[PDB]
Amino acid sequence: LPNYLVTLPARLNFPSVQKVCLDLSPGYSDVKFTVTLETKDKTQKLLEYSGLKKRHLHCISFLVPPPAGGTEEVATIRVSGVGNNISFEEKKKVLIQRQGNGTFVQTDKPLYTPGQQVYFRIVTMDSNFVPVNDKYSMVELQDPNSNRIAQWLEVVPEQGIVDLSFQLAPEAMLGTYTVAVAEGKTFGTFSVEEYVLPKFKVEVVEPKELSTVQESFLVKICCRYTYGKPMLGAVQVSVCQKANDKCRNLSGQTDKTGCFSAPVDMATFDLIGYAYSHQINIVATVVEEGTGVEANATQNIYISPQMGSMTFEDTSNFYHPNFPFSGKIRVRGHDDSFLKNHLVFLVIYGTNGTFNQTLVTDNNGLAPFTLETSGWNGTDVSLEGKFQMEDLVYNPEQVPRYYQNAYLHLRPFYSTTRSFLGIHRLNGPLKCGQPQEVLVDYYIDPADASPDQEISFSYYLIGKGSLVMEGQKHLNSKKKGLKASFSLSLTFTSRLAPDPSLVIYAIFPSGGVVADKIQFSVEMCFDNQVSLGFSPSQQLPGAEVELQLQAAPGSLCALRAVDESVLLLRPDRELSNRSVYGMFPFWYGHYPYQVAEYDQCDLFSFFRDVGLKILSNAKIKKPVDCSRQYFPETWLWDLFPIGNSGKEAVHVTVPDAITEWKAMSFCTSQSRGFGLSPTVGLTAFKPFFVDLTLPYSVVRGESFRLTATIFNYLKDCIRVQTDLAKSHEYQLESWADSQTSSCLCADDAKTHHWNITAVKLGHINFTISTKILDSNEPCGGQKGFVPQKGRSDTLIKPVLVKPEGVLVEKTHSSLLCPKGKVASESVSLELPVDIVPDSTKAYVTVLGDIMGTALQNLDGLVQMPSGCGEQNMVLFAPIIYVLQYLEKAGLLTEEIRSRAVGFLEIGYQKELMYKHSNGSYSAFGERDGNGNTWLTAFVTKCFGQAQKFIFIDPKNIQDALKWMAGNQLPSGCYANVGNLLHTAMKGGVDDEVSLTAYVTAALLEMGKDVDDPMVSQGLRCLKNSATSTTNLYTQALLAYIFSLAGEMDIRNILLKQLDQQAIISGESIYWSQKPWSEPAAVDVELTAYALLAQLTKPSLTQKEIAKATSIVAWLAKQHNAYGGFSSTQDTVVALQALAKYATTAYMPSEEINLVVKSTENFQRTFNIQSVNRLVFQQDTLPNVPGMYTLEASGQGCVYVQTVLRYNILPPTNMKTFSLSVEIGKARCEQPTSPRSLTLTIHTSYVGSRSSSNMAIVEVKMLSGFSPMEGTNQLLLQQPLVKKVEFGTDTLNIYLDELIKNTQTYTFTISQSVLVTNLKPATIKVYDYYLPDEQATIQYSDPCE
């Protein structure tokens, strides 16, 4: 009786092909054997064949049918042998699926400080590691506040991968940002928080996890710097053990190596019983002498058992009856440590008997074993292998040690053949690509076999589910019963699994089967063979290195070169050729996959675990089983398309560090596949490391200490040689060795000192010059070693030498507007008699139009510290208004578009921290409960008009309108929660009509229609007070809300109201609440409201423009300094007005000829073209400040400004704010290096109003001083302080409402650099929205 075999793969994946195989016995030869599959949509023939006179094995590849009715479905594979009126038919239910393509997100770091650009890559792969070029529809980047802040649409992948960039804000939120891919199918999370660790790290080396067989131990508490340097200090070490707390404390001092050894004995703690905790903690507190700071180290040690657990990792699920089965057992203790000469007990349970036997192990922990199944006689048996007779002990009060017995159950190799085929496994991990040689012996039983035929072995090499290789070996069966062996040749790729299989079966044409499979263990390899090599991988920081990258031809690769501690932070979250695996292989265990068809619930028991869809006609019918250091910037993050040669050599420059760089790469190719490289290291080694401690802030005429500490790194004695370049910008006194070389040996430090005084101003560079020289004298009994590289170092560090006194700026903006004629203007700028010498500068700015001064200074505008929600919008909202001007006039080029939108997500990220859990936007954020409704209207207006430029989430605008629904009165008007606004035009108590006007005008400007219900409801509120209003700011804003809509009959009424209170200041008219050009604050924004109400007529009127250019002629001369309109809200309202005027009165501006003239016969020419209208034209005036002459000719309306800055010994005010300070503590006889002196500041508002709007007290620091560490917390603990900010030389403290009462704020400062002859330092308090109401005093130090 001849027999046949049909084999198909189990899972039928869509984008690739599979393989079908047919095995036919000698005999038949007239019977057509065919395989075909039937689906619900189509049917194709897989294979037709006819029998031969020999044993044949035919295998062909086939493409799967497309899936229908979803992704997962079940087809029917159908085998027919037809002939001699005999039909062998079957029907087997087989599963066909569209598999899930694997994908991952690779970020640049798992941890970023704020202010760094995040880079990431998105990679999609199939199950065979070929890249997928399916287009990503929409990808997003979200904050820790679950709010999307970036979004890319319709992004295409380049060879399956795509890279993206996102610049974070300098003030960014803290938490895990999330990159979401394809509506949230893929998440990549990276943490962003600000970590700076200047404290020296205290570590251990020899303390590790301990066992119970330890009676004594040595603890090496070693305290070292972040770059790595020992110091001398006293260490107290508490080694404690908790209770379900036996502790011992010791004290010592570290040596010159910095590692202190202490004997810790286990007998002082709980070691036998488990009534106490199983974890022992070491707390080391280090106090350095002369510092007083305490460094804390916590190290936990868990008590580990001596032995681990046994699992039958390499054990077959069957047994050969009446014939021996051999194998090996790997024995190891705890955490995969091999135990030499360990003892293993194995017991069999069955009907024959529960026999026990014992085995000894070798030094490698691999013990061979043989088992004889002569007496079992086809019965179900159980295997139990353990270490000893001891088992698990259960106790609710004590945590037991982990133990797991090696238990298995075996069921009866179901056949009619008693021949034997050998089992030959080869070691642990295997290699890929090399032809592996394996030998497997066999045996032939003469009773069930005939010597006339020839023997044949058919083997299937199966990996990643489907069968990969096949083959046949025909040998002579005339030798009959012997222990012969046959050879095999094996090629392994990534198509083979990490745990693939090889099955051999021999089948006789007279009758009988014998089968055996071997499970392998291959290292997770790839079709793409990549190599990330370095030259020379020991390079000095500063010189370029050669990176060689090898892959398959036609590949796209991606580098990630970063610090080693970035890899040491997270053991996971990197590509380590296990992360790219894992999601794919889960086909183990169960033979069907959502298929209810079974055979007897053996060949079925063989092909249950790793096998295929296999059917035959042999004996198969039997019931069987059916179941910690810093994180610097990253070195490389680049993309590289490599050529057909497969090599890519790139010269890349190392960063200036002392650390060791690690690089990781992956390569993607459509022809071959994916390839991942291990992390290959490059050490950046420098011989000597210097550290220049230098004060940022210093006043001229002071002195400070220049410091040039050199820390050795080589393990010998070197001769350093420090130098300072002599310059005329500073004078010096040599406290150092004065160009004398020293003997610095290994792990030894030296400190130099210089006394530096300053005679100039500005940024002054200090240049160090250190060099190991060729010594003529031996140091420490040995010759001074000269390294061949890194022999020199030239570090340059700057100082900011600010002048004494306070900076007073003076501006005189002009609006020469030539209507075909010559327009002239004189500028009068004068200096006081008490100016600080050589501190005066003057500069004239010429531009071709308006809305280009804001365009140059889109960042900034105000000179004020933007740390609140009402003031952040000078870096967000005039960008929207100037680009509305450039979009409605068609002058928006692409480069200013890209710069402005980059500033826009910077302002978006900075604004989004003032959002709440609700939709409202307060000023300071997360401390005010419910936010301000007016600022919510302002941010809703500038989010509605910015979503056509950048990506704004519509969810936060929708929550803003939900908060508008929450603040809608039944009278039709708009209310507010809390008392925190701008100047409020009189100090207004009601403010309801102006608030409702601004909310509804913001809704109309953002894009809502008149027939909108909130807009119509606010307008129905304002018909009540449409005419009867008195405040000029409220009248101009009310003329804006009635001029945005089409209520012209009362817009003309309000215009006639505004013509009564319009101050006719010559040819320029304007409006003011309380009636050289020094600007005021609220009159600028209310005449901006008047100008905005003028220019919102849809019908152009020539009489309207004649009044409008007079209002512009007043409004554009109030430009304070570089940005304009001194405060923040004044600036955004007046730039909105001037942008609306510039849209509604747009000019061609072909050419303007302008002459700047002065009294020193200094004249210069500016020429304005059409394209040259948006350049910030600048000239520093060399004249002594007096009068200047400005004339313009041509067609257009240009803007000219002149800014004068000088320094003044600051006079007091004593009429708006009363300000005083005094200095306590300060020692003056025991100064040391932390000269901690306190400052107590008494503030009050003695002005005319009931309360100031919002105040900034600006402690400009003394030279070389810092505000200690805890002053931020103890200033937030004091009342009426919302935010304290120390940028680089000033402490700005933000006050909510400063009043008639006197508030005392105290804070202590400590210097970092020693300073001598301290100049006085200023303290200034101003109203934020009225900066001219300021009070400036000065303080000093009573010692020097």
Our CA angle for 1048, 1049, 1050, nearest 5°, is 90
Name the strand (E) or helix (H) holding 34: strand 32-38
Q: Which two tokens stand for residue 1272?
A: 């931020």
Q: How far apart, in whole angstroms, are the C-alpha atoms of residue 20 and residue 49? A: 12
Measured on CA atoms in the order 948, 952, 954, 957, is the torsion positive or negative? negative
For residues 560 and 532, the answer to whether their CB atoms sit within 8 Å is no
Report the DSSP beta bridge partners of residue 732.
Answer: 756
Cis peptide upstream of residue 536 (ω within 30 degrees of 0): yes
| 994 backbone dihedrals φ, ψ, rounded to 5° | -75, -35
Q: For tokens 């008490």, what's the residue? A: 834
CA atoms in the 13 A half-sphere facing the CB of 731: 7
Q: How far apart, in whole angstroms, are the C-alpha atoms of residue 1126 and residue 1143? A: 24
Q: For tokens 């974890």, what's the residue? A: 279
Q: How far apart, in whole angstroms, are the C-alpha atoms of residue 342 and residue 362? A: 8
Measured on CA atoms in the order 1223, 1224, 1225, 1227, is the torsion positive or negative? positive
For residues 770 and 725, the answer to whether their CB atoms sit within 8 Å is no
Give a three-class secondary structure readout of 529-595.
Answer: CCEEEEECCCCCCCCEEEEEEECCCCEEEEEEEEEHHHHHHCCCCCCCCCCCCCCCCCCCCCCCCCC
Q: What secondary structure letter does DSSP report for 803?
A: P
- Strand order across the 1290-1295 sheet: 1283-1286, 1290-1295, 1255-1260, 1321-1327, 1334-1339
Q: How far apart, in whole angstroms, are the C-alpha atoms of residue 571 and residue 579? A: 11
For residues 885 and 894, the answer to whether their CB atoms sit within 8 Å is no
Report CA-CA distances (Å) from 536 to 539, 551, 654, 665, 677. 6, 20, 12, 18, 18
CA atoms in the 13 A half-sphere facing the CB of 442: 23
Q: How far apart, in whole angstroms, are the C-alpha atoms of residue 840 and residue 1185? A: 9
| 730 backbone dihedrals φ, ψ, rounded to 5° | -155, 160
Q: Which one, of 73, 53, 56, 57, lies nearest residue 65 by Cα?
A: 73
Q: Where are the alpha helices (DSSP H) in 414-540?
A: none
Measured on CA atoms in the order 884, 888, 890, 891, is the torsion positive or negative? negative
Q: Where are the alpha helices (DSSP H) in 747-873?
A: 853-856
Q: For tokens 């309380």, what's the residue? A: 1074
Q: Which two tokens stand for residue 155?
A: 């992004």
Q: What secondary structure letter does DSSP report for 376?
A: T
Report the DSSP beta bridge partners of residue 118.
Answer: 166
Under the phi-then-psi rule, with left for phi > 0, alpha for psi from -120 to 50, and beta for the rest, what region is 270?
A: beta
For residues 381 and 257, the answer to whether their CB atoms sit within 8 Å is no
Report the DSSP beta bridge partners of residue 250.
Answer: 237
State which approach was used to obtain the coordinates.
cryo-EM
For residues 615 and 79, the answer to whether their CB atoms sit within 8 Å is yes
For residues 83 and 32, the answer to whether their CB atoms sit within 8 Å is yes
Q: How far apart, in whole angstroms, are the C-alpha atoms of residue 392 and residue 387? A: 12
Q: Which one, of 994, 1001, 855, lies nearest residue 938 by Cα?
A: 1001
Burial of 794 (0-12, 13-18, 19+ CB in 10 A): exposed
Q: What secondary structure letter does DSSP report for 175?
A: E
Q: Which one, of 1138, 1148, 1259, lies nearest residue 1199 by Cα?
A: 1138
Q: Which one, of 45, 20, 35, lies nearest residue 81 by Cα?
A: 35
What's the domain range around 214?
A: 201-302
Name the strand (E) or helix (H) holding 250: strand 246-253
Task: DSSP for 483-496, please give it.
Answer: --EEEEEE---SSS
CATH number of the domain residue 244 falls in: 2.60.40.1940
Roughly what angle, to the nearest 10 degrees, separates helices 1082-1094 and 1048-1058?
Answer: 140
For residues 118 and 99, the answer to whether their CB atoms sit within 8 Å is no
Q: Which two tokens stand for residue 25?
A: 């016995």
Measured on CA atoms in the order 580, 581, 585, 586, is the torsion positive or negative? negative
Burial of 685 (0-12, 13-18, 19+ CB in 10 A): middle
Report the DSSP beta bridge partners of residue 158.
Answer: 161
Q: How far apart, in whole angstroms, are the C-alpha atoms of residue 1266 and residue 1261? A: 7
Q: Which two tokens stand for residue 1260?
A: 């400009």
How far from the centroid of its chain's Cα atoms is residue 155's Cα?
21
| Cβ-proximal residues to 575 (8 Å cutoff; 6+ apart), any chain | 104, 106, 664, 666, 676
For residues 891 and 1144, the answer to whether their CB atoms sit within 8 Å is no
Grouping H, G, I as helix, E, B as strand and the rest as coil, residue 402 is: coil
Q: How far apart, in whole angstroms, are the C-alpha atoms of residue 61 and residue 9? A: 11
| 908 backbone dihedrals φ, ψ, rounded to 5° | -70, -45
Q: Which residues of 640-655 are buried (b: 16+ CB within 10 A; e: fewer)?
A: bebeeebebeeebebb
CA atoms in the 13 A half-sphere facing the CB of 216: 2
Q: How far apart, in whole angstroms, are the C-alpha atoms of residue 502 and residue 491? A: 12
Q: How far apart, in whole angstroms, are the C-alpha atoms of residue 773 and residue 1179? A: 49
Q: Which two tokens stand for residue 1281?
A: 């302080």
Q: Which two tokens stand for residue 1217?
A: 């704010």
Q: How far apart, in whole angstroms, are the C-alpha atoms of residue 1126 and residue 1080? A: 8
Neighbouring CB atoms inside 10 A of 997's CB total 27
Q: How far apart, in whole angstroms, are the C-alpha atoms of residue 952 and residue 943? A: 7
Q: How far apart, in whole angstroms, are the C-alpha atoms of residue 536 and residue 528? A: 25
Q: Which two tokens stand for residue 721?
A: 């040689």
Report the DSSP beta bridge partners of residue 13.
Answer: 97
Measured on CA atoms in the order 34, 35, 38, 43, is the torsion positive or negative? negative
